[PDB]
């Protein structure tokens, strides 16, 4: 079972913006999760070949990872904060769907998600 192409990070005809909320999602949210000791499995698309998970992309039909989110934010790919928040939530949900409670990867996702939620709680009002 092969790896699919990664999610889109560039699309010139897609409408996109910089908003103060999206700037916060890069400078605070992404930066905080990316530096965490448990970030590494989430910093790029899941390599189902190298990890020997031939079922991964048969089960996970909306893949997402922080490498992709990082490129999207750096490329100003998003229209709004909700689109980016959805990508994070998709990432965590995929992990919980594929794995089982108490697995190392789930504990790692849970730690990152706790911080994500703490930072989103302080999302600035749009300017
Ligand atoms: C605990 C462990 C053991 C073996 C390899 C690992 O590294 C790793 N790297 C990328 C993805 C995953 C991963 C995800 C994963 C990671 C990020 C994501 F966004 C979605 C799924 N879901 C399950 N795994 C592994 C597959 C092999 N058996 C252990 C669990 N794990 C990890 C950490």
Q: By what technique were these coordinates determined?
A: X-ray
Q: How is the chain split into domains, by residue range?
A: 19-123
Resolution for this PDB entry, in angstroms: 1.5
Distance, CA 23 to ligand 1 centroid (Å)? 29
Please compute Rg for the chain using Cα positions. Answer: 15
CB atoms within 10 A of CB 3: 14
Take residue 57 and report the two structure tokens written for it: 């992309």
Nearest-angstrom CA–CA distance, 79 and 23: 12
Residue the block writes with tokens 């996109």: 16
6 CB-near residues (< 8 Å, 6+ apart):
45, 63, 68
Among 33, 92, 105, 108, name the best residue to mutate to test ligand 1's pocket (greatest count of ligand atoms within 8 A of Cβ).
Answer: 105
Cα within 13 Å of Cα(40), Cβ side? 3
Cβ proximity of 89 and 69 under 8 Å: no
Helical segments of the chain, H only: 20-24, 31-34, 56-59, 66-74, 81-98, 104-120
- Which architecture characterizes domain 19-123 according to CATH? Up-down Bundle (1.20)
DSSP character at residue 40: G
Burial string for 17-27 (b: 16+ CB within 10 Å, else e) reads: eebebbebbbe
* Distance (Å) of CA 86 to CA 49, 65, 81, 82, 120: 26, 11, 9, 6, 12
CA 29 to chain centre: 11
Local structure of residue 64 (DSSP, 8 states) = -
Please name the residue whose Cα sits nearest to atom 30 of ligand 1.
105
Of the candidates 91, 78, 73, 79, which has an alpha carbon nearest to the alpha carbon of residue 25?
73
Ligand 1 binding residues, C-beta < 6 A: 41-42, 46, 51, 53, 65, 91, 94-95, 98-99, 104-105
């Amino acid at each position: 079972s092969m790896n699919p192409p990664p999610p889109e990070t560039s699309n010139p005809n897609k409408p996109k913006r910089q908003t103060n909320q999206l700037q916060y999602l890069l400078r605070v949210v992404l930066k905080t999760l990316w530096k965490h000791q448990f970030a590494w499995p989430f910093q790029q698309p899941v390599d189902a070949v190298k990890l020997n998970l031939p079922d991964y992309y048969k089960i996970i039909k909306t893949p997402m990872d922080m490498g992709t989110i990082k490129k999207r934010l750096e490329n100003n790919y998003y229209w709004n904060a909700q689109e980016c928040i959805q990508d994070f939530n998709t990432m965590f949900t995929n992990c919980y769907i594929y794995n089982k409670p108490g697995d190392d990867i789930v504990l790692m996702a849970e730690a990152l998600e706790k911080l994500f939620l703490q930072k989103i709680n302080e999302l600035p009002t749009e300017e």
